[PDB]
Symmetry: D4
Subunit: 89 residues, 8 copies
Amino acid sequence: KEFQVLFVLTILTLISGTIFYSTVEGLRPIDALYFSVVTLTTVGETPPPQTDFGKIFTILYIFIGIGLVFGFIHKLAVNVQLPSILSNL
Amino acid sequence: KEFQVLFVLTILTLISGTIFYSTVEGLRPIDALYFSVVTLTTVGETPPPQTDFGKIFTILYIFIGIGLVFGFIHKLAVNVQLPSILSNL
Amino acid sequence: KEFQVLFVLTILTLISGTIFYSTVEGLRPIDALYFSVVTLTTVGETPPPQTDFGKIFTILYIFIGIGLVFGFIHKLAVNVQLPSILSNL
Amino acid sequence: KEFQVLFVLTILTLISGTIFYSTVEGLRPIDALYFSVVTLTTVGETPPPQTDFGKIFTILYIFIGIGLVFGFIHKLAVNVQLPSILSNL
Amino acid sequence: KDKEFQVLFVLTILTLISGTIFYSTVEGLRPIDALYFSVVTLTTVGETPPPQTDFGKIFTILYIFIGIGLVFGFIHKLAVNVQLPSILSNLVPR
Amino acid sequence: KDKEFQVLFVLTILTLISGTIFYSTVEGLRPIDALYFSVVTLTTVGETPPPQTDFGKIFTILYIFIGIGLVFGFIHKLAVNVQLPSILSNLVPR
Amino acid sequence: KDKEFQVLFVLTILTLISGTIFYSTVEGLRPIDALYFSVVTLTTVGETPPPQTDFGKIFTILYIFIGIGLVFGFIHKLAVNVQLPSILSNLVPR
Amino acid sequence: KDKEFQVLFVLTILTLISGTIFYSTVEGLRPIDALYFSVVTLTTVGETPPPQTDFGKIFTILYIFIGIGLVFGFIHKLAVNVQLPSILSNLVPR
């Protein structure tokens, strides 16, 4: 249930960026999904937003979304991917 | 009070970068606010500073500011956004 | 054995990206190895993938791979590089 | 002594990148210092290395250096910058 | 954060109040001694004799499992969120 | 997560069952008292006399080292994964 | 870091000194026994009888809640910041 | 990691051996009882009487402060690095 909710809370957040950048920044959804994924995960290998609105949202989106996104990657890591290898080794 | 202070310490830090880059690098404040936000959060999807002074400051600003910035995102996450969803689920 | 496995799990993951980007994105292996290394570590100082397939994979690769990659850097840090300096100081 | 050593271990590491990129990549030291600082801290707002040698080193440098660099920012944060504000509030 | 120290505090008092009612009725302790038996049992000090009735024995087992984690939770929150900061302010030069 | 609380729970019962069989046979305790001696020894309360036989003494040393970590593991998982959330839901206004 | 081990150390001594004064006056213990009762009560060992006066009982409850967290804080800082490094240096080949 | 469990293990045995020598000489305990007094005092169980000599009392105070942190360090490393993985492998279907 914890991995379920972190997973849902993440998808929704990603869905929200995707709708946002693909409307406001004019990205195709796949590129907007990617800009959301690499921004929240802090990879950051894209150019920055071009509209001021996309800039203000990216700031709010990063503060709100990073903690949830990293929360999932953490619970994903230690509660789903690890045991698999760990019991197996 | 802890979420208050981390929040203030953050705003001030952001305000300090914003004043800095919008003066020294010639950015408009909104872009300077963004360069500060994506640099401290380690997203990093902008070009680097262009002046040597902006470069020296970005190094000091990253060391000083990252720990405070990530401190807020953490307390924000676990003490304000989580309970909301957690009590609700 | 823990530092061994985290090390192997990492190499394999890196090997998987390297095969991927050097085939799908057309990178030479050394550049594909680098795109995998700087993406999983969240440095992110390259352009983004150019194919949609490379984009979808980079999203999955980041979620799966970041937790393992940061796990290794952590165990590397505290169990191999630290003691060396710490016993020595 | 702990904040001293983490501080020294960091400077040395930065000094090592700076010598490296300013020789191998042809950067002026100030830009090489910056590429080292934003790469180890995972900001990553520069282009990637241009030589294959600079690429291989950046991979090794990131694995070795990130754990030490983040160790300092952490001890800096919680043992030097925090108390200052915390005792004061 | 304080609401947290408040509830842990209340949850503790209640638990202690429960033991006190229990041992002072079932074991025949005076409340002050029953309060003490609850406090030194949950905190794991344990410098009293054990319960004498089988009912007091069964309850002490359940009481220890349920109560130890709450009790030690309060001592910890007490420690870091009320005594520490106070120590910190008390050590400031003025 | 629950499977975790299940196993810690089982591992604990078994351990307690082992002590109970042990002290009630070797020390001559009635099972209820042997269950209690195991519970207050592993939880470190310790409000009983010590074992009387040398065999009960050797076993209590090994039993404490092996069992304390499991027992305290269950009290912790119990605490944060079963009592806490319940406390949290119980404090929701409806 | 050391200043931290210094203060935790002082805070502890003071606390112990307080109990010692207390039990040796109110309970009629000789100071050495009162020092011991404070040390084994705060550390949760608890291999003494309980207090005999109601005043000693009330104080032991408050003393345990206030003192356990500090005492266990010192044992922890002692452990990782003074005994460990020493263990580490002691295990270096020369 | 194992070297860590090895040393914690050795450090513990030595400490126990020290108490055992001590109480069996100074307190007049037989070694098996002195081993037990050391084990239940460091682990904070504490289901024995206290020391009878003032020297045994002073040593038990120092012994508790120095030893508790090491002893609890071993029980923890024992727990997560030797018993847990074993539990984990033991619960694998084959």
